[PDB]
Amino acid sequence: FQLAKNFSAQKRVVSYMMPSLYRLLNILITYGIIKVPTYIRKLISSGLLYLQDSNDKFVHVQLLINLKISPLMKSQYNMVLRNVMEYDVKFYEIFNFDQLVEITEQIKMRILSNDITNLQLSKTPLSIKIMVAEWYLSHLCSGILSSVNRTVLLKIFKIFCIDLEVFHHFFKWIEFIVYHQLLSDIESLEALMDILLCYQKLFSQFINDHILFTKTFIFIYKKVLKEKDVPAYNVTSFMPFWKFFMKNFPFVLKVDNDLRIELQSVYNDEKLKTEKLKNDKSEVLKVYSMINNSNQAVGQTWNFPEVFQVNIRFLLHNSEIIDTNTSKQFQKARNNVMLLIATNLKEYNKFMSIFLKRKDFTNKNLIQLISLKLLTFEVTQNVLGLEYIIRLLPINLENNDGSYGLFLKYHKEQFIKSNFEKILLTCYELEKKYHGNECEINYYEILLKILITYGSSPKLLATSTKIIMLLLNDSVENSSNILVDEIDHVEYYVMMDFANLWVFQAFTCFCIKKIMENNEPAMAMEDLKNFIFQIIEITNSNDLCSQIFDQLKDMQTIEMITQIVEKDFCTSCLQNNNQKIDDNYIVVVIEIITSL
Numbered sequence: 001f002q003l004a005k006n007f008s009a010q011k012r013v014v015s016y017m018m019p020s021l022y023r024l025l026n027i028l029i030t031y032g033i034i035k036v037p038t039y040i041r042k043l044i045s046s047g048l049l050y051l052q053d054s055n056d057k058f059v060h061v062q063l064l065i066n067l068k069i070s071p072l073m074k075s076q077y078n079m080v081l082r083n084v085m086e087y088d089v090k091f092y093e094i095f096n097f098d099q100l101v102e103i104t105e106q107i108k109m110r111i112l113s114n115d116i117t118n119l120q121l122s123k124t125p126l127s128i129k130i131m132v133a134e135w136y137l138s139h140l141c142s143g144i145l146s147s148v149n150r151t152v153l154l155k156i157f158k159i160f161c162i163d164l165e166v167f168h169h170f171f172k173w174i175e176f177i178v179y180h181q182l183l184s185d186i187e188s189l190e191a192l193m194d195i196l197l198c199y200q201k202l203f204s205q206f207i208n209d210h211i212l213f214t215k216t217f218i219f220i221y222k223k224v225l226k227e228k229d230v231p232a233y234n235v236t237s238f239m240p241f242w243k244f245f246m247k248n249f250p251f252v253l254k255v256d257n258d259l260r261i262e263l264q265s266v267y268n269d270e271k272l273k274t275e276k277l278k279n280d281k282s283e284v285l286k287v288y289s290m291i292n293n294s295n296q297a298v299g300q301t302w303n304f305p306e307v308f309q310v311n312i313r314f315l316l317h318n319s320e321i322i323d324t325n326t327s328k329q330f331q332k333a334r335n336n337v338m339l340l341i342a343t344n345l346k347e348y349n350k351f352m353s354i355f356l357k358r359k360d361f362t363n364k365n366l367i368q369l370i371s372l373k374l375l376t377f378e379v380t381q382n383v384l385g386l387e388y389i390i391r392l393l394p395i396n397l398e399n400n401d402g403s404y405g406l407f408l409k410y411h412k413e414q415f416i417k418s419n420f421e422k423i424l425l426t427c428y429e430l431e432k433k434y435h436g437n438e439c440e441i442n443y444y445e446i447l448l449k450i451l452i453t454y455g456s457s458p459k460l461l462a463t464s465t466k467i468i469m470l471l472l473n474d475s476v477e478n479s480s481n482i483l484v485d486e487i488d489h490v491e492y493y494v495m496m497d498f499a500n501l502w503v504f505q506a507f508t509c510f511c512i513k514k515i516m517e518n519n520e521p522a523m524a525m526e527d528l529k530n531f532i533f534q535i536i537e538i539t540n541s542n543d544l545c546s547q548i549f550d551q552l553k554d555m556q557t558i559e560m561i562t563q564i565v566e567k568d569f570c571t572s573c574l575q576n577n578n579q580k581i582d583d584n585y586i587v588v589v590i591e592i593i594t595s596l
Contacts, residue, residue: 002051009480019063019126023164032066036074043081058082062092063126065164099128100135107136112154119161126164133165141175148182149319152190154391170204177213184224185323187217189393191234196396208249211241215255227279228331231263267334276335283324296332296339303329304347304361311360314390329365344370355382363395368402380413381426384433403441407450410437411457435477438504448503452556455507474504488512492536495549502552509536509549510556517564529571530578537596546596 001007022030039057046053061078064071072093079092088095099122106114122129140147140155147155159169173193176182182190194201214234238256245252269275277292280299284291291298306325310316333340344367347353353361359382362371371383386395403410417430438454441447459471465485475494478501491512498505516528536553540546558565579593 006479009482013481015059018060020163022060022064023130026065032064032070032074035064036078039078054082054085058086058088062088065127065130068096068131095125096128096131099125100132103129103132104135107132107139112158115158116161129162130164133159133162133168137165137168137172140172146180146182147176148186149189150391152176152182152186153393156193157391166200167204170206174204174206174209174213177210177216181217181220184221184226188230188233191237192394192397195233195237196394202244207241207245208252211249211252211255214238215251218255218259225282226327227275228266228327228334229262230266230330230334231259235259235263270334273335276331279331280328283328296336296343299328299332300340300343300347303332303365304353307365308353308357308361312357326365333365341370345374348374355379359383359386360392364393368398372402377417378426381417381429381433384437403437404444404447407441407447407454410434411454435474438474439478439481443501443503448506449559451503452507452510452559455504456511456556456560459508459511471508478504488532489535489539492539495536496539496545498545498548502548505549506552506556509553510560513553513557513568514560514564517567526571526574529568530575533572533575541592541596543595 026032039061042053042057046057057078061075061082064075066075076093079086079088079090083089102118102121105111106118119129136159156169156173159165173190181187238259241252242256273292276295277290280292280295281287281290303325307322307329310322316322348370355376355378358366358371358379362368362383363386368383371379375383386399388395411434414430414434417426418434421427438451441451443451462468462470468491472494475497491508495505495509513529513532516532517525519525519528533553536549537546540549554565554568557568
């Protein structure tokens with residue numbers, strides 16, 4: 001509508017959802033002509049000026065991703081009708097051509113900074129970016145030379161910024177797979193992208209070929225200088241494919257079996273020091289400085305120092321040296337796990353490395369588990385959120401996995417963090433992180449119990465009316481998610497607003513119910529429990545929503561206590577009986593009453 005802050009966030013978020021739906025909807029079941037006819041019919045209604053109507057049509061018409069031949073007559077004509085009081089006004093199609101030229105010029109040579117700027121400029125129009133991606137995709141496919149190293153990360157990362165060509169990136173990756181193979185080090189890095197893909201990987205439906213492609217890479221490798229040949233990231237992906245695929249094939253099974261054995265054999269032969277020395281010598285390129293004795297003692301410090309100094313700047317003349325250093329560090333770790341752990345522990349104790357520098361180090365070689373086990377309070381906050389704006393290897397999975405793994409550690413940190421409340425840094429960050437973390441975390445069944453447990457503790461923990469107001473903050477954050485003294489009924493209405501993200505609502509309801517039930521008087525519970533339940537149910541007055549609310553209240557109560565839930569059912573049964581009792585006398589409103 002017009003000038004509504006609450007409405008705008010929902011509508012705006014709704015507008016982004018609608019744009020995604022338009023992209024997906026158009027590809028499988030949508031008509032360009034039917035959509036245009038509907039928009040034309042809609043303007044007619046808005047002959048009298050309406051602030052809300054004009055903006056929506058322009059916004060939807062602006063990025064419908066219509067075919068260029070079909071769109072020009074229709075889109076331009078539509079714009080002409082709505083030209084009065086329109087910022088875009090005339091020549092919308094020309095803007096698309098200009099945007100395509102800007103995208104193309106930057107893409108062909110350099111312009112890494114320019115590409116980022118182009119997205120910022122083109123944030124307003126989604127459609128222009130989509131057209132540009134196709135041109136970019138064709139150029140990449142045509143070049144005979146195989147993409148490698150940083151360019152692949154940059155090429156995909158840059159493309160990643162434009163939302164529309166999700167498929168294009170996958171197609172390009174497959175073609176790279178179809179095409180002659182790139183450098184081996186890059187290939188290991190490339191898989192990282194596949195791992196990040198997760199469920200989205202399934203959409204491509206090139207899995208049979210992919211297995212074949214993976215095997216082909218195994219067949220293809222010849223001139224590889226890495227003795228270790230670690231396949232853990234790749235082995236994990238193969239394991240996911242076996243579990244995910246749930247099928248047996250001749251080509252896939254033999255390749256998977258062959259890949260596990262080589263890694264096991266290298267680890268077993270890992271103890272021998274001749275292989276370790278030989279691998280180390282090639283990277284070092286000096287025969288005399290074997291450093292076979294106490295390699296962890298000296299090399300780790302060198303690896304720690306050499307890597308740390310140039311990684312942040314990322315201006316190194318040679319791409320080869322950093323990779324060599326990383327390989328050496330990995331080899332030492334593989335050679336002695338205990339020694340590697342000791343070295344990692346030693347580095348933390350020294351504390352000669354900046355927290356920002358440490359985060360970058362964790363992304364590539366350092367273990368998150370070691371950082372997680374022992375860390376500074378300030379460091380822990382830094383550890384939770386990492387900045388990936390600068391080009392870097394994807395670290396999306398480790399962070400995602402830790403978050404998915406537990407609810408007790410994060411809650412504990414927030415509680416400890418919340419108490420200090422000082423220096424306007426860590427404390428401020430912790431409050432933001434906890435709110436952000438809950439929203440970020442998926443409402444998994446296992447997660448919901450943890451979420452309910454934490455939410456209940458938060459609600460239960462507050463001993464003041466003012467804090468009660470603070471929860472208000474959580475609902476607003478949930479319904480926003482952008483980077484006098486009243487009593488129980490308002491809270492009930494707030495609980496009532498909810499659509500799907502019910503973990504918080506359920507926790508609040510459960511806490512309220514528990515408090516009401518525990519009035520310490522047998523007589524008191526009946527008087528309050530019945531009234532609270534009826535008001536909550538009466539206020540909902542609905543079908544699906546009411547069912548959810550009852551279930552949530554019932555579910556939360558049952559989860560907290562099996563017996564308490566049973567007690568609620570008895571109270572509910574008594575409440576139901578009272579409603580049933582009226583039935584003989586009342587003879588009215590059966591449909592509304594029965595459904596609830």
